[PDB]
C-alpha cells in the first residue's frame, strides 16, 4: 500500500474528497528500461514487503550514461495486490512529473519479471540520520556559495535553513499537483549530492512494525506525532495537514534530529494534550523566526495555516539573496538534465 494520494475533485461543501485512482491512469511505456542494463548493489533499506537497492544504470540517462540509482522492488512472496500498489506508485510518479526537491522517477522494469522502480540516488541518506551524524560538528554563526555544494565544512544554521527552504519548495510542487503526502517527516526527506533535499515516500522499503514512531490504529499504524489534529481525530488528510507535519519536521531539523515531543509517549493523555492546544517549545537551535513558522503551521484551524507557496517566501527572506540565486541556477540545470 502507498500513502500518497492525489486529489481529483472536492464536493461543494466540501466534506468529501475524491482521490484519483492510479490503476485508472495509463502507464507510459516510454519509461521502460531494459533489465540487463541495470546492475544491483547493496540494499539501502529493507522492510516488511520489499526493499530499495543501490544500483547502476547504463544508458538510462543521456546526460549521465553511467548512473548510480536506487531501485525499489517487491519481495518474492509478492502478494498480488502489492504488485498493483507498486505499479500504482509508478503511475503516480509519472502523473506528478519531476521536481528538484522530490526523489524523481527515472525508469522502470515491468515487462518480464519482478517490477522495478528506478529512482534518484541520494548520497547522504535520510535527513534524520544525517543530522545525528553531524550533531557534534554543529556551530551556529562565500559561506552561501558553498551551501548547495558537496564541499566539506561544519554544519551551520544556513544549512538548516537550506533544508527548510528546499522541503517547502518540494511541498509546493506537491501541493500544486493536489498531492497530499500524509507522512511528511525528516525520515522521509533524503539528501542528494550537492546537498539537495528530496522528499519521498520510504513506505514500501520501510517496515512500520519495527519503527518506533508509528502507533497502531484500527489495523493500521499512523505517524501520530506528525499528524494534524483533524487527521488524528477526524481522519482527514489535506495539504493543510501536511503543513502541520512540515512544522513538526522543522522542529526535527532545528533540534538536530530530536524526537518530537521528547519524553511524551503517544497515549490517552497525549491526545488530550494535542486537543488541549499543547504545542512544543522552541528547540535549542531554532532562530526566533523559524519557531514562529512552526507555530503558524501548528494552528488548530487548518485554513489559518500558511500555504506551502507562502512558506517558501518566508524562508527565502531568512536566507541571503545569493542563496536564491544559487537555487535558481540548480533549478535550471536540473530541468535541462538529459
Ligand X SMILES: CCN(CC)CCNC(=O)c1c(C)[nH]c(/C=C2\C(=O)Nc3ccc(F)cc32)c1C
Q: Is 51 known to sit in a ligand binding site?
A: yes
Query: Contact positions toward ligand X, by CB under 6 A?
Result: 44-45, 52, 70, 72, 103, 119-123, 125, 129, 190, 200, 202, 205
- The answer to whether 257 is annotated as binding is no
Q: Is 47 annotated as a binding residue?
A: yes
Q: With respect to Cl ion, which residue has the nearer C-beta, 6 or 78?
A: 6
Element (H, E) at 319: none
User: What minimum distance in Å lies between the beta carbon of 335 and Cl ion?
Assistant: 10
**Alpha-carbon distance values, 33 to 58, 61, 83 (Å):** 10, 11, 18
The closest alpha carbon to 246, from 130, 140, 127, belongs to: 127
Least separation in angstroms between CB 8 and ligand X: 26
**Per-residue buried b or exposed e for 27-52, using 16+ beta carbons within 10 Å of the residue's own CB:** beeebebeeeebeeeeebbebebbbb
Asked whether the beta carbons of 231 and 33 are under 8 A apart, the reply is no
Q: Please, what is the minimum distance in Å from the beta carbon of residue 331 to Cl ion?
A: 5
Nearest to 249 by CA among 273, 272, 277, 227: 227
CB of 55 to ligand X, least distance (A): 10
C-alpha torsion sign, points 58, 60, 62, 68: negative
Query: Toward Cl ion, which CB reaches closer, 6 or 155?
Result: 6
Which of ligand X, Cl ion, none interacts with 181 (beta carbon under 5 to 8 A by kind)?
A: none
> What does 103 interact with, of ligand X, Cl ion, none (CB < 5 to 8 A by kind)?
ligand X
Partner from ligand X, Cl ion, none contacting 328, C-beta within 5 to 8 A by type:
Cl ion
> Which residues make Cβ contacts (< 8 Å) with residue 53, sequence separation at least 6?
40, 41, 42, 43, 44, 70, 71, 72, 73
Q: In this chain, which residue has its C-beta nearest to ligand X?
A: 125
CB nearer ligand X, residue 33 or residue 298: 33
89 versus 242: smaller Cβ distance to ligand X? 89
Would residue 333 show up in a list of annotated catalytic residues for this protein?
no
97 is in an annotated binding site: no
Contact assessment for residue 117 and residue 60, using Cβ atoms and an 8 Å cutoff: no
> Under rule CB under 5 A, which residues in 311-330 are in contact with Cl ion?
328
Q: Which of 183, 211, 234, 284 is catalytic?
A: 183
* CA–CA separation, 221 and 228 (whole Å): 15
Grid coordinates given for 329: 541556477
- What's the closest the beta carbon of residue 121 comes to ligand X, in angstroms? 5
Out of 75, 95, 279, 331, which residue is the one contacting Cl ion (CB under 5 A)?
331
Which is nearer to ligand X, 165 or 202 (by Cβ)?
202
Q: Is 68 in the site for Cl ion (CB under 5 A)?
A: no
**Does 312 show up as a binding residue in the annotation?**
no
Nearer Cβ to Cl ion, position 196 or 215? 196
**197 annotated among ligand-binding-site residues:** no
Residue 50 annotated in ligand binding: yes
CA angle 181, 186, 190 (to 5 degrees): 85
3 touching Cl ion, by CB under 5 A: no
Partner interacting with residue 228 (select from ligand X, Cl ion, none; CB below 5-8 Å by kind): none
* Chosen from Cl ion, ligand X, none, partner binding at 331 (C-beta under 5 to 8 Å by type): Cl ion
52 is in an annotated binding site: yes
Closest distance to Cl ion from the beta carbon of 219 (Å): 37
Residue-wise DSSP of 15-77: S-EEEPPGGGS---GGGB--TTT-EEEEEEEE-SSEEEEEEEEESS-SS-SEEEEEEEEE-TT
The three-class DSSP label of residue 223 is: coil
Nearest Cα neighbor of 185 from 144, 214, 217 is 214
Which residues are documented as binding site for ATP? 44-52, 72
Active-site amino acid positions? 183
Q: Which residues bind Cl ion (CB under 5 A)?
A: 328, 331
Amino acid at each position: 500500500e502507498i500513502r500518497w494520494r492525489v486529489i481529483e475533485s472536492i464536493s461543494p461543501d466540501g466534506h468529501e474528497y475524491i482521490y484519483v485512482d492510479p490503476m485508472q491512469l495509463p502507464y507510459d511505456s516510454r519509461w521502460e528500461f531494459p533489465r540487463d542494463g541495470l546492475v544491483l548493489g547493496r540494499v539501502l533499506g529493507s522492510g516488511a514487503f520489499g526493499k530499495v537497492v543501490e544500483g547502476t544504470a547504463y544508458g538510462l540517462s543521456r546526460s549521465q550514461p553511467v548512473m548510480k540509482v536506487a531501485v525499489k522492488m517487491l519481495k518474492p512472496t509478492a502478494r498480488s495486490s502489492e504488485k498493483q500498489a507498486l505499479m500504482s506508485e509508478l503511475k503516480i510518479m509519472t502523473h506528478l512529473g519531476p521536481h528538484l526537491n522530490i526523489v524523481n522517477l527515472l525508469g522502470a522494469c515491468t515487462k518480464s519479471g519482478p517490477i522495478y522502480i528506478i529512482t534518484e540516488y541520494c548520497f547522504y541518506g535520510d535527513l534524520v540520520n544525517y543530522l545525528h551524524k553531524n550533531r557534534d560538528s554543529f556551530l551556529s554563526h562565500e559561506v552561501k556559495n558553498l551551501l548547495s555544494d558537496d564541499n566539506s565544512e561544519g554544519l551551520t544554521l544556513l544549512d538548516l535553513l537550506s533544508f527548510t527552504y528546499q522541503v517547502a519548495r518540494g511541498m509546493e510542487f506537491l501541493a500544486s499537483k493536489n498531492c497530499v503526502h500524509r507522512d511528511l517527516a525528516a525520515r522521509n526527506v533524503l539528501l542528494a549530492q550537492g546537498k539537495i533535499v528530496k522528499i519521498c515516500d520510504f513506505g514500501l522499503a520501510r517496515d512500520i512494525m519495527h519503527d518506533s514512531n508509528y502507533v497502531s490504529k484500527g489495523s493500521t499504524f499512523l505517524p501520530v506525532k506528525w499528524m494534524a489534529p483533524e487527521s488524528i481525530f477526524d481522519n482527514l488528510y489535506t495539504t493543510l495537514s501536511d503543513v502541520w507535519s512540515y512544522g513538526i519536521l522543522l522542529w526535527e531539523i532545528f533540534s538536530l534530529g530530536g524526537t518530537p515531543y521528547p519524553g511524551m509517549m503517544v497515549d490517552s493523555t497525549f491526545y488530550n494534550k494535542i486537543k488541549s492546544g499543547y504545542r512544543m517549545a522552541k528547540p535549542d537551535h531554532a532562530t526566533s523566526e523559524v519557531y514562529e513558522i512552526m507555530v503558524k503551521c501548528w494552528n488548530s484551524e487548518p485554513e489559518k495555516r500558511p500555504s506551502f507557496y507562502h512558506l517558501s517566501e518566508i524562508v527565502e527572506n531568512l536566507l541571503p539573496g545569493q542563496y536564491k540565486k544559487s537555487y535558481e541556477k540548480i533549478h535550471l540545470d536540473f530541468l535541462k538534465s538529459d
